[PDB]
């Protein structure tokens, strides 16, 4: 059957981009036009996380909106107080080349992974009084480019092995796996739900998941590069994957294709992280060229600038109550904007 | 002062996590820590043992210097995503098996991979100690296998002396950053451990031009 | 998780002892250590401070020139050197932990203390209280006035609550208001706001009978409120 394929499924893949051509009536940035823009957006670094010593690579808030966790390329993960710029923990990992870090919603944990090929999840609420070890999570076969929890005992982590895999934190199991990608996994996002999350990888495409089924529900491809970032619309039927081609996109979950696309001539760097503001009017996108545009989510214009890195923006956080906006970089500082 | 007794000891606390934050620091400044890189065959996995998954940390302390060597050929995935965590390692050890020249499409790849690392720009101030492993195969590989096979226009002798000083041309010369870059060749001795001796000799030499580099005095 | 502190006993009028408290199952580098004596059939007072790394040390204004309050870090002990020991410091001395950060809960564990009989401006915390009597399953109420409002301006109202069951050492309760200790049942809730507090207990079990005392942490000294017991 053409080598066994072509016969339905490089057709089968014309329905699709048929049926996606039929249900696209008028695009977002019509239907979504003559309505006010934001106005320029001049947010101030309100603070300035001095005390990594190499490359921050991750970030994460926690739920209560004033904690953060960073990982940085020393083995150290530092827990921040974001108000009062204190130091809650520094925790000494094991593997030194983490690239992903991620805070329990219930605060009681944190996560950790990188070239390590292991998740290791930190309590932080010890009777002992410092932060132990509570788990380490093996089974991927390449770096852990993502982790993030569900709750206290599952965490989804993504790795570099072209797979992400749910986890059962109480055991060291991965109890499914996720198996659709055809590249490296680079970063994935719960929905607000924790029913649904969506991944994206080095193969141009990102993948719906279901958590429960363990199925890959949809598939979106628009981009010409690596997805190194994606973020749920905080409604949780549309996301953001920015990439290394310079461009974010707003694909839509029900509709099922691309809705709007970010991009801007003088931009030709990859994107390392992307994130929407609470009511998700805002498209933050952490650029390889030291910035971090602020695009119209619902219209296309880059509304602002946080230029105040001296290096790669790695990694950006929006606070889960919308107040601020934290941002690492590859120099040691995390400022958090306001 | 508007810190309250509590707010005021977790500031204690949070001045007493920066010490040891910039004290542990310090005490992994004093290390060298090296990427080690090549087409794993034979020689990566002889040299770590040379000297005593995803990352294989191997620590040597030679004449009051102690070395990390990070070896990451068990990572397999797309290189390009994980290489800029190396970034600003002192060196390069990238291992080169000279027995690869007649396996000729093996030899030809570790010149394919040479092109790639030592051409990033992750890398254009990183200098590559490059070994040149099994020099004892190469010795009697050539007694019967000759070169040119993997070298179509080597027009030259057979005896080693141009045999092997050929290799040493061909990778020094896919250095395209002859300016921002050294590369530090020896061939592997196997019998002696001044392979270490190599690695400590081109690891002053590269720290000391980059504090003259530092400060300016270039 | 266990401190056990000996040293003192009997000792004659403007001498000296070194009581000690051997900490064990814990990150004691991590932990301040305050000293808390309880003078006998009496409340709880406030001794000695020093912080973790010994970068801070505060003292009651009773005991600021004759205590000296020190730690041994690998060792993991605890000292108070005590000199010209006068009547009013006979006491059980408590040992507590207490450990800071945003979301920490200081004063969670108290050593079992040692006893010592010698021979022979600030926050007020009033709970006018003694005695109250109830029976199980019944619905308790305590409160506790402060002489300035231990709500700061960060929105930290300093408010501890202990629990001191017969021959026990005290046992937190709730911290800084309405925040539950780990380990402690949810039955017991904390309220109040300014200088007005009030411990309430649901559904009052045979184990919660004691003295009740409320401390302010707002700024040294520490002082505790007098005991309230609840006798059934």
């Known amino acids: 059957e053409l080598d066994q394929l072509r016969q339905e499924a490089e057709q089968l893949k014309n329905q699709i981009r048929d049926a996606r051509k039929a249900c696209a009536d008028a695009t977002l940035s019509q239907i979504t036009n003559n309505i006010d823009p934001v106005g320029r957006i001049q947010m101030r670094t309100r603070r300035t996380l001095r005390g990594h010593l190499a490359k921050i690579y991750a970030m994460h808030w926690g739920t209560d909106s004033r904690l953060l966790v960073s990982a940085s390329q020393d083995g150290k993960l530092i827990i921040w107080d974001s108000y009062t710029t204190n130091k809650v923990h520094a925790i000494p990992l094991r593997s030194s080349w983490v690239m992903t870090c991620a805070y329990a919603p219930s605060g009681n944990y944190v996560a950790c992974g990188g070239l390590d090929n292991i998740c290791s999840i930190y309590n932080l609420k010890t009777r002992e009084g410092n932060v132990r070890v509570s788990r380490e999570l093996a089974g991927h076969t390449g770096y852990l480019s993502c982790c993030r929890f569900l709750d206290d005992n599952q965490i989804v982590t993504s790795s570099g092995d072209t797979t992400c895999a749910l986890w059962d934190i109480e055991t060291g199991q991965q109890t499914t796996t996720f198996t659709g990608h055809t590249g490296d996994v680079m970063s994935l996002s719960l929905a607000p739900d924790t029913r649904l999350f969506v991944s994206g990888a080095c193969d141009a495409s990102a993948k719906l998941w279901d958590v429960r089924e363990g199925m890959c529900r949809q598939t979106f491809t628009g981009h010409e590069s690596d997805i190194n970032a994606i973020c749920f619309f905080p409604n949780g039927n549309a996301f953001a994957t920015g990439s290394d081609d310079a461009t974010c996109r707003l694909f839509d979950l029900r509709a099922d294709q691309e809705l709007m696309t970010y991009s801007h001539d003088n931009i030709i760097c990859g994107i390392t992280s992307v994130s929407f503001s609470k009511s998700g009017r805002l498209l933050l996108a952490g650029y390889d060229d030291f910035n971090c545009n602020v695009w119209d989510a619902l219209k296309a214009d880059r509304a602002g600038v946080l230029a105040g890195h001296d290096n790669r923006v790695s990694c950006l956080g929006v606070t889960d109550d919308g107040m601020a906006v934290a941002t690492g970089s590859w120099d040691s500082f995390l400022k958090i904007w306001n | 002062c508007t810190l309250s007794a509590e707010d005021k000891a977790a500031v204690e606390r949070s001045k007493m996590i920066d010490r040891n934050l910039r004290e542990d620091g310090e005490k992994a400044a004093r290390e060298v820590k090296l990427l080690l890189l090549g087409a794993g065959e034979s020689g990566k996995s002889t040299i770590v043992k040379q000297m005593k998954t995803g990352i294989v940390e191997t620590h040597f302390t030679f004449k009051d210097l102690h070395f990390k060597m990070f070896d990451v050929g068990g990572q397999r995935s797309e290189r390009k995503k994980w290489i800029h965590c190396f970034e600003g390692v002192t060196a390069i050890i990238f291992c080169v098996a000279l027995s690869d020249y007649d396996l000729m499409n093996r030899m030809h790849e570790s010149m394919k991979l040479f092109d790639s690392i030592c051409n990033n720009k992750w890398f254009t101030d990183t200098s590559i100690i490059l070994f040149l492993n099994k020099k004892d195969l190469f010795e009697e590989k050539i007694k019967k296998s000759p070169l040119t096979i993997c070298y179509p226009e080597y027009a030259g002798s057979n005896t080693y002396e141009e045999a092997a000083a050929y290799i040493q041309c061909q990778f020094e010369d896919l250095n395209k950053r002859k300016d921002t870059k050294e590369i530090y060749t020896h061939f592997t001795c196997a019998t002696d451990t001044k392979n270490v001796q190599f690695v400590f000799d081109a690891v002053t030499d590269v720290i000391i031009k980059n504090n003259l580099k530092d400060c300016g005095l270039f | 998780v266990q401190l056990v502190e000996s040293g003192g006993g009997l000792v004659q009028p403007g001498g000296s002892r070194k009581l000690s408290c051997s900490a064990s199952?814990?990150?004691?580098?991590?932990?301040?250590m305050h000293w808390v004596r309880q003078a006998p059939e009496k409340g709880l007072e406030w001794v000695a401070y020093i912080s973790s790394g010994s970068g801070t040390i505060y003292y009651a204004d009773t005991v600021k020139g004759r205590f000296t309050i020190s730690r041994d870090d690998p060792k993991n002990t605890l000292f108070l050197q005590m000199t010209s020991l006068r009547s009013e410091d006979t006491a059980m001395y408590y040992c507590?932990?207490?450990?800071?950060?945003?979301?920490?809960?200081?004063?969670?564990?108290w050593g079992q203390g040692t006893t010592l009989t010698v021979s022979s401006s600030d926050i007020v915390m009033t709970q006018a209280t003694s005695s109250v009597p109830v029976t199980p399953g019944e619905s308790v109420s305590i409160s506790c006035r402060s002489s300035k409002s231990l709500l700061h301006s960060n929105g930290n109202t300093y408010l501890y609550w202990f629990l001191q069951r017969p021959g026990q050492s005290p046992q937190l309760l709730i911290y800084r208001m309405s925040n539950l200790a780990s380990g402690v049942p949810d039955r017991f809730s904390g309220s109040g706001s300014g200088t007005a507090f009030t411990l309430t207990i649901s559904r009052l079990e045979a184990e919660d009978v004691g003295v009740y005392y409320c401390?302010?942490?707002?700024?040294?000294?520490?002082?505790f409120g007098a005991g309230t017991k609840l006798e059934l």
């Open positions: 507590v932990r207490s450990i800071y950060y945003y979301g920490s809960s200081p004063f969670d564990f």
């Open positions: 199952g814990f990150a004691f580098s991590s932990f301040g």
């Open positions: 401390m302010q942490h707002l700024e040294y000294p520490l002082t």
